[PDB]
Structures are given as C-alpha cells and as structure tokens.
Short mmCIF file of all heavy atoms in Angstrom, two decimals:
data_model
loop_
_atom_site.label_atom_id
_atom_site.label_comp_id
_atom_site.label_asym_id
_atom_site.label_seq_id
_atom_site.Cartn_x
_atom_site.Cartn_y
_atom_site.Cartn_z
N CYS U 10 0.80 -1.22 0.00
CA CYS U 10 0.00 0.00 0.00
C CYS U 10 0.84 1.27 0.00
O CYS U 10 0.27 2.37 0.00
CB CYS U 10 -0.92 0.01 1.22
SG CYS U 10 -2.59 -0.58 0.90
N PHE U 11 2.16 1.16 -0.02
CA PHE U 11 3.05 2.30 0.14
C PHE U 11 3.94 2.43 -1.09
O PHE U 11 3.73 1.77 -2.11
CB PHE U 11 3.85 2.17 1.43
CG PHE U 11 4.11 0.75 1.82
CD1 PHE U 11 5.00 -0.02 1.11
CD2 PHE U 11 3.46 0.19 2.90
CE1 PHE U 11 5.24 -1.33 1.46
CE2 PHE U 11 3.69 -1.11 3.26
CZ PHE U 11 4.58 -1.87 2.54
N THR U 12 4.95 3.30 -1.00
CA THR U 12 5.85 3.58 -2.11
C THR U 12 7.29 3.15 -1.85
O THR U 12 7.94 2.64 -2.77
CB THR U 12 5.85 5.08 -2.42
OG1 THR U 12 4.52 5.59 -2.27
CG2 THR U 12 6.30 5.31 -3.85
N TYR U 13 7.80 3.33 -0.64
CA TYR U 13 9.18 2.98 -0.31
C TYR U 13 9.21 2.04 0.88
O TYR U 13 8.30 2.05 1.72
CB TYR U 13 10.01 4.23 -0.01
CG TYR U 13 10.04 5.23 -1.14
CD1 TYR U 13 9.68 6.55 -0.93
CD2 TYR U 13 10.45 4.85 -2.40
CE1 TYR U 13 9.71 7.46 -1.96
CE2 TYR U 13 10.48 5.76 -3.44
CZ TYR U 13 10.11 7.06 -3.21
OH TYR U 13 10.15 7.96 -4.25
N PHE U 14 10.26 1.24 0.96
CA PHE U 14 10.34 0.18 1.94
C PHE U 14 11.80 -0.04 2.34
O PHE U 14 12.71 0.20 1.54
CB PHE U 14 9.75 -1.12 1.39
CG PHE U 14 9.61 -2.20 2.40
CD1 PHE U 14 8.60 -2.15 3.34
CD2 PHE U 14 10.47 -3.27 2.41
CE1 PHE U 14 8.46 -3.15 4.27
CE2 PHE U 14 10.34 -4.27 3.35
CZ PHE U 14 9.33 -4.21 4.28
N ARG U 15 12.00 -0.51 3.56
CA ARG U 15 13.34 -0.87 4.03
C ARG U 15 13.22 -1.82 5.20
O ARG U 15 12.37 -1.64 6.08
CB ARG U 15 14.14 0.36 4.45
CG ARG U 15 15.62 0.06 4.63
CD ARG U 15 16.34 1.21 5.29
NE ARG U 15 16.15 1.20 6.73
CZ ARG U 15 16.83 1.97 7.57
NH1 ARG U 15 17.76 2.81 7.14
NH2 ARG U 15 16.58 1.89 8.87
N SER U 16 14.08 -2.84 5.22
CA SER U 16 14.07 -3.82 6.30
C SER U 16 15.23 -4.78 6.11
O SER U 16 15.73 -4.97 5.00
CB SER U 16 12.76 -4.60 6.33
OG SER U 16 12.77 -5.61 5.34
N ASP U 17 15.64 -5.40 7.22
CA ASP U 17 16.55 -6.53 7.16
C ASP U 17 15.82 -7.74 6.58
O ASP U 17 14.65 -7.66 6.20
CB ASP U 17 17.09 -6.84 8.55
CG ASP U 17 17.58 -5.60 9.27
OD1 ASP U 17 16.86 -4.58 9.24
OD2 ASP U 17 18.66 -5.66 9.88
N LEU U 18 16.51 -8.87 6.48
CA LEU U 18 15.93 -10.03 5.83
C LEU U 18 16.62 -11.29 6.33
O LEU U 18 17.85 -11.36 6.35
CB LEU U 18 16.06 -9.92 4.32
CG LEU U 18 15.50 -11.11 3.54
CD1 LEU U 18 14.66 -10.64 2.38
CD2 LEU U 18 16.62 -11.99 3.06
N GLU U 19 15.83 -12.29 6.70
CA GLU U 19 16.32 -13.57 7.18
C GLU U 19 15.96 -14.65 6.17
O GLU U 19 14.82 -14.71 5.69
CB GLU U 19 15.72 -13.90 8.55
CG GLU U 19 15.37 -15.37 8.75
CD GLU U 19 15.20 -15.73 10.21
OE1 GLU U 19 15.15 -14.82 11.05
OE2 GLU U 19 15.10 -16.94 10.51
N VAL U 20 16.92 -15.51 5.86
CA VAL U 20 16.77 -16.50 4.81
C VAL U 20 16.78 -17.89 5.41
O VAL U 20 17.40 -18.14 6.45
CB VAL U 20 17.88 -16.37 3.74
CG1 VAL U 20 17.75 -17.46 2.70
CG2 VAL U 20 17.81 -15.01 3.10
N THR U 21 16.09 -18.81 4.74
CA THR U 21 16.10 -20.22 5.10
C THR U 21 15.97 -21.02 3.82
O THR U 21 15.41 -20.56 2.83
CB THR U 21 14.97 -20.57 6.06
OG1 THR U 21 15.10 -19.79 7.26
CG2 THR U 21 15.02 -22.05 6.42
N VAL U 22 16.51 -22.24 3.84
CA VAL U 22 16.43 -23.14 2.70
C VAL U 22 15.97 -24.50 3.19
O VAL U 22 16.18 -24.87 4.35
CB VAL U 22 17.77 -23.24 1.95
CG1 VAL U 22 17.61 -24.09 0.71
CG2 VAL U 22 18.28 -21.86 1.62
N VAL U 23 15.34 -25.26 2.29
CA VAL U 23 14.78 -26.56 2.62
C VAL U 23 14.90 -27.45 1.40
O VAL U 23 14.81 -26.99 0.26
CB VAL U 23 13.31 -26.44 3.07
CG1 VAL U 23 12.67 -27.81 3.18
CG2 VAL U 23 13.22 -25.70 4.40
N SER U 24 15.09 -28.74 1.64
CA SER U 24 15.27 -29.71 0.57
C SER U 24 13.93 -30.24 0.09
O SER U 24 12.97 -30.34 0.86
CB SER U 24 16.15 -30.86 1.03
OG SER U 24 16.24 -31.86 0.03
N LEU U 25 13.87 -30.57 -1.20
CA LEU U 25 12.70 -31.22 -1.78
C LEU U 25 12.99 -32.64 -2.23
O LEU U 25 12.21 -33.22 -2.99
CB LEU U 25 12.17 -30.41 -2.97
CG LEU U 25 11.61 -29.02 -2.68
CD1 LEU U 25 10.98 -28.45 -3.93
CD2 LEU U 25 10.60 -29.06 -1.55
N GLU U 26 14.11 -33.22 -1.80
CA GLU U 26 14.46 -34.59 -2.14
C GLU U 26 14.80 -35.35 -0.87
O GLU U 26 15.28 -34.76 0.10
CB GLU U 26 15.65 -34.63 -3.11
CG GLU U 26 15.44 -33.82 -4.38
CD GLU U 26 14.30 -34.34 -5.22
OE1 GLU U 26 14.01 -35.55 -5.15
OE2 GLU U 26 13.69 -33.54 -5.96
N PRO U 27 14.56 -36.67 -0.85
CA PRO U 27 14.79 -37.43 0.38
C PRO U 27 16.28 -37.63 0.64
O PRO U 27 17.00 -38.16 -0.20
CB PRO U 27 14.08 -38.76 0.11
CG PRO U 27 14.10 -38.90 -1.37
CD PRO U 27 14.05 -37.51 -1.95
N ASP U 28 16.73 -37.20 1.82
CA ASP U 28 18.09 -37.45 2.29
C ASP U 28 19.12 -36.90 1.29
O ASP U 28 19.84 -37.63 0.62
CB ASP U 28 18.31 -38.94 2.54
CG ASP U 28 19.56 -39.21 3.36
OD1 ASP U 28 20.05 -38.27 4.02
OD2 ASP U 28 20.03 -40.36 3.35
N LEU U 29 19.15 -35.57 1.22
CA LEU U 29 20.05 -34.86 0.32
C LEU U 29 21.08 -34.07 1.12
O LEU U 29 20.79 -33.56 2.21
CB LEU U 29 19.27 -33.91 -0.59
CG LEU U 29 20.11 -33.10 -1.57
CD1 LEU U 29 20.84 -34.01 -2.53
CD2 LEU U 29 19.23 -32.12 -2.32
N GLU U 30 22.28 -33.97 0.57
CA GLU U 30 23.36 -33.17 1.14
C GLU U 30 23.67 -32.02 0.19
O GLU U 30 23.92 -32.24 -1.00
CB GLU U 30 24.61 -34.02 1.36
CG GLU U 30 25.32 -33.74 2.67
CD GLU U 30 24.45 -34.01 3.87
OE1 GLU U 30 23.66 -34.97 3.82
OE2 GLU U 30 24.55 -33.25 4.86
N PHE U 31 23.68 -30.80 0.73
CA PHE U 31 23.84 -29.62 -0.11
C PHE U 31 24.43 -28.49 0.74
O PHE U 31 24.59 -28.61 1.95
CB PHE U 31 22.52 -29.19 -0.74
CG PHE U 31 21.55 -28.61 0.24
CD1 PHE U 31 21.56 -27.26 0.53
CD2 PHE U 31 20.61 -29.40 0.86
CE1 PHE U 31 20.67 -26.72 1.43
CE2 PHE U 31 19.71 -28.87 1.75
CZ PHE U 31 19.75 -27.52 2.04
N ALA U 32 24.74 -27.39 0.06
CA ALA U 32 25.25 -26.19 0.70
C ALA U 32 24.69 -24.98 -0.05
O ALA U 32 24.14 -25.10 -1.14
CB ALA U 32 26.78 -26.16 0.71
N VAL U 33 24.84 -23.80 0.56
CA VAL U 33 24.25 -22.57 0.05
C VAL U 33 25.30 -21.47 0.10
O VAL U 33 26.05 -21.35 1.07
CB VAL U 33 23.00 -22.18 0.86
CG1 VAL U 33 23.38 -21.76 2.26
CG2 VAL U 33 22.23 -21.08 0.16
N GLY U 34 25.34 -20.65 -0.96
CA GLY U 34 26.29 -19.57 -1.05
C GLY U 34 25.60 -18.26 -1.38
O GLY U 34 24.47 -18.23 -1.85
N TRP U 35 26.32 -17.16 -1.13
CA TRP U 35 25.72 -15.84 -1.23
C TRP U 35 26.80 -14.81 -1.49
O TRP U 35 27.95 -14.96 -1.05
CB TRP U 35 24.96 -15.50 0.05
CG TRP U 35 24.42 -14.12 0.11
CD1 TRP U 35 23.23 -13.68 -0.39
CD2 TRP U 35 25.03 -12.99 0.73
NE1 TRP U 35 23.07 -12.35 -0.13
CE2 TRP U 35 24.16 -11.90 0.56
CE3 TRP U 35 26.23 -12.79 1.42
CZ2 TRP U 35 24.46 -10.63 1.04
CZ3 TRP U 35 26.52 -11.53 1.89
CH2 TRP U 35 25.64 -10.47 1.71
N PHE U 36 26.44 -13.75 -2.21
CA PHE U 36 27.32 -12.60 -2.40
C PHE U 36 26.48 -11.34 -2.47
O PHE U 36 25.33 -11.40 -2.92
CB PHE U 36 28.17 -12.74 -3.67
CG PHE U 36 27.38 -12.95 -4.92
CD1 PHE U 36 26.93 -11.87 -5.66
CD2 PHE U 36 27.11 -14.22 -5.38
CE1 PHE U 36 26.21 -12.06 -6.81
CE2 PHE U 36 26.39 -14.42 -6.54
CZ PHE U 36 25.94 -13.34 -7.25
N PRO U 37 27.01 -10.20 -2.04
CA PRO U 37 26.18 -9.01 -1.88
C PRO U 37 25.75 -8.36 -3.19
O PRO U 37 26.18 -8.78 -4.27
CB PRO U 37 27.07 -8.07 -1.06
CG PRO U 37 28.44 -8.47 -1.41
CD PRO U 37 28.41 -9.95 -1.65
N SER U 38 24.91 -7.34 -3.08
CA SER U 38 24.41 -6.65 -4.26
C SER U 38 25.54 -5.90 -4.96
O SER U 38 26.35 -5.23 -4.32
CB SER U 38 23.30 -5.68 -3.88
OG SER U 38 22.73 -5.08 -5.03
N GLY U 39 25.56 -5.98 -6.28
CA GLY U 39 26.56 -5.27 -7.06
C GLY U 39 27.88 -5.99 -7.18
O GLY U 39 28.94 -5.35 -7.12
N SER U 40 27.86 -7.31 -7.34
CA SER U 40 29.07 -8.09 -7.53
C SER U 40 28.78 -9.16 -8.57
O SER U 40 27.78 -9.10 -9.29
CB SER U 40 29.55 -8.69 -6.20
OG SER U 40 30.89 -9.12 -6.30
#
C-alpha cells in the first residue's frame, strides 16, 4: 500500500528430495 520500503531479511532453505546433502552460497548486491 506504500511507495518505499526498508528492512533486514532472514533467509532459510529446505530440501525437496529425500536425504540430500547440499550447501548454500551468497554474495552481496553489485558483484
């Protein structure tokens, strides 16, 4: 309902396959 927004953000990941091993990576905006 507004025009501008700002907030932190918390992330989570979940598997869709039985008994899977994985990892997650990230890099900031503008790279």
Side-chain angles (χ1 to χ4, degrees):
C10 264
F11 30 71
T12 323
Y13 302 126
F14 189 76
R15 193 190 81 169
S16 79
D17 313 45
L18 179 135
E19 142 162 11
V20 176
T21 301
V22 185
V23 170
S24 175
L25 295 187
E26 304 297 332
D28 195 18
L29 179 63
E30 222 60 37
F31 71 88
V33 68
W35 174 86
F36 56 89
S38 184
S40 196

